[model samples]
Target: SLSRFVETLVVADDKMAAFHGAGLKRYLLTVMAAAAKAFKHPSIRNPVSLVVTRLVILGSGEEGPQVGPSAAQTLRSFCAWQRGLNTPEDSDPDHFDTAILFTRQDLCGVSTCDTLGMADVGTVCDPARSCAIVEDDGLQSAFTAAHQLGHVFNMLHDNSKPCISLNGPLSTSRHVMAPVMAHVDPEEPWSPCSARFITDFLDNGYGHCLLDKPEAPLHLPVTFPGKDYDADRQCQLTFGPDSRHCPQLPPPCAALWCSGHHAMCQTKHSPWADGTPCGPAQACMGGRCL
Candidate 1:
């Protein structure tokens, strides 16, 4: 869980957020370490572990590190430059990638869907590739950054739970709960309470599955599970989210046990298949047909 390299891209509008090297250094000293700490601290004491080795903070494009509109501008403008802001290499499934933005403008939460930034579910599944995005200067900035990282790792928000953070329900709720649940944990990226769910997610085995197959890798997710999937000798090749990769609970049959053109009903008084005698009724209730 904790051994992938996270390629970090640092972006900002003006100097306050990030400049040449010092600003970047300051970010690492102040923010990066904190986010990393959250992952290593109390709760995650891996296979469910993503032992963050280091955030390879890459400087943004030479042209002012890629400019963009602030959250307060207009909802559309705030989102326009999003996906494009990421580097082309981010799409590379071969490696983990992530980015953090220190903007001249604060993140807009209300009109622009509120809060600091957003996480890309499709892109995030690869912390080893394209990770989550965030605003560098928001309330609980470090924690929020980590929060975005969580989404990139296939984590979900259990919104139904109640808030328990000191920030209270208005701004802070249960850090351990889903963000939509109004969970605003200032301390850790994930609340200790939420750790179990994280574990379950990892245990689902999605983490070990091979990600980003060519939609048709080499030449096949071929019909032969062993032959086509040979690229992944571990037998953890991903069949894409569309294919069933995990075990499931019982699924009810589309038609009833007794159906059309037939039936104990068609045969109206037919006894139960088990023939456990219907001593009192016509159709069996615990084999006692009614």
Candidate 2:
């Protein structure tokens, strides 16, 4: 088969849902979908199966993945919930095979951890038992979620590629592992090493949670009337006008603010100028012209 779906449940806090609202949920789902494309192989070319199945909303005042031990406390809470499921380990007809908690902020109380999402390792915590925690503040969270889930599988930094012979190749080769521990938007494929990382886990049965699963995709609780939402033809009309406009409001959008929303794509527009502060998406190892 060319592609297969790795079903996952997306749990959200009531407050977080309220914050992004109904419309943005669609955007967030798209973000998740975009993040999932990195999983496919030549199967050999690529696949979109590692996708979000449904976004489960919690009831009022319920326990969400916010406010926990580490920046990845959300995963801990989700695994704890699963541990209490009282059901067998293998997946079932209606249980979530993989769970991902998407929130606005992680209350780890640290500046850096709050930006990038986190996860428990396969060695320290059971792989399938561990959930992935990602922020929904914007696409930055969307960008990081997929990587954090990779970390859950105990993936090493994808820096083993041999891209260091071109122009000052060390910096370029480092770019090879953008989302590993880095915050760059995805511009590369799963380095053969990265793909091997996944295959190794699957071969070892770490992905047993997703084995022998149902074909039904994760769906919304309240869906449209007909068969499916038919979200393409008329779906694009739903977004507000300023969805693409960069936000610089309230002054001083440094670090998290500017990089996430404002300057990540600037490199694609213009060359990096000397001393031109790099966004969270890039490393400032060397200064080029403006």
Candidate 3:
């Protein structure tokens, strides 16, 4: 049941497609709200300027000839709506720094991967060029829209990891889904949707270039159920020998250790032992196995 639930929660059906312009606007607002919450931590710096990043929408022929007018107007209305929520001193309601556009090129089939959407400095959506939206189902369209947005914010998917583990078919799939932006399942629960991923990434230092400053400390502290980890141990467990063990920690533990803490070990000691010295095969940094 757990596996089934996870499957349902993570994988999206290929049949779902077609993202409505209004829907995309609503989704962006939801994403921003979630980001505000996830990034409330003190150590996690929320660069005010970064929050001002723009959203722009463009169109391709695939979205249909009418898309150019509809998408553009939708973008404008969406920005105005967002500004109405709580106008910021530096925020603009008429234009977005980031852009989103639609195209009608017939990039692919309804359920097949073809032109798909792309997110760069701006985001492009080619609904007609790629796949027809699944009638009566909005999951795929919503998922794709959010997934592209994630790219603009700088997130990789769980599957983006260089190597895939061989424990099982699921393990391999898991690796494939590692990239934060990978759309493993178009029907995943809204809680774990691409928007959520982008929120987590921003709160954890994804889009902020200042995070790379020398005094800024590239990594944040790894927060655990009871304690926060230091920097050195975080590095050893992240890129060092203990990296394999990273998956064994609890979800919260792993999340905090990886993205939240800047890739540090969260567990104070080897999860397997209390205070034993780390063996050659064991990964130990700062008296922790994380």
Candidate 4:
């Protein structure tokens, strides 16, 4: 069968629920649903199903490591924690293939580049280090998680040397594996580069554990993400807690303009995430108000 199953362990750190507020579990599941959607996109053509084996939320007294500003250092400590969380069931690859940590911190990469997520390249089946760290960015976190999972499957950035050589430069629109998470098109979420890289990686026997088909299905909670995460909250997540959606701004669906403490509307040159409210009776989907 061409189908692959990846049992994933999702962890929400201490500040996650509090920062996002109520219905966070539903919101997080919606984010995972979006991530799962990316895998089924036609361009990728890989039938990969993400099973949430466990969802852990750290409580007040629980010791959860503080994540970045720095992605590399945080990943090291995060991976160490994941390695120590072993149980009898975790010994089976089908039970837990990869563990992803969702943090509420603002991470940074080289220089001033804000890092959204990070993962060890080509370590999907390796239990010792198959881990990833993602900074929750509202609905956009789905793309960030999908991108990190791509790295775990050994897929390089679309513009990376090997990928570029194999598939040439990207088109006007961006895809899931783009180096930066800007101007990504939801209509076609995977690039030729991403598709080719993942196919090559899987065909080469690296995706051995993912080949097994699970006997049962996971029943994830379904919720209206837009209701849980309003445009104001999404704006806050994108910018800062002081930021808000500037309703006075023109072109409601195309680009999201947010106002910060200065009250001046600015854009990060990215569209609002799907299911973000744009009007009284409408919502943003695939960058369109509908």
Q: lDDT of each structure?
A: 0.37, 0.45, 0.29, 0.74
Error of 2 at 152 (Å): 2.7
Per-residue lDDT of 85-153 in model 4, one digit per residue for the tens? 644453454367788988877665341332387887899888778889888866778878898998898
lDDT for each residue of candidate 3 in 76-150, tens digit (9 for 90 to 100): 333333333222321233222233333332333333331144433212121111111111111122234444444
Best by lDDT: 4
Q: Which digits, one per residue and each the tens of the lDDT, describe model 2 over residues 75-167?
A: 567666644432454355445556677665545454346235666645312434657666554433544666666655555555434322222
Q: What residue runs in model 1 are displaced by over 4 Å at the alpha carbon?
A: 1-7, 12-21, 44-61, 64-67, 70-95, 109-114, 125-129, 161-189, 208-290
Flag the better candidate by TM-score, 3 or 4: 4
Residue by residue across 42-64, what tens digits does model 1's lDDT show?
55423232222223333344443
Q: Which residue pairs in candidate 2 collide?
A: 41-44, 42-45, 53-218, 273-289, 273-290
TM per candidate comes to 0.45, 0.61, 0.28, 0.85
Off by over 4 Å in 2: 1-5, 41-48, 69-72, 82-86, 89-91, 106-115, 123-128, 159-187, 219-290
How far in Å is the alpha carbon of 76 misplaced in model 3? 20
- Residue 158 lDDT in candidate 3: 36
Better model by lDDT, 1 or 4?
4
Candidate 2 CA-lDDT value:
0.45
What's the lDDT for residue 94 in model 4? 39
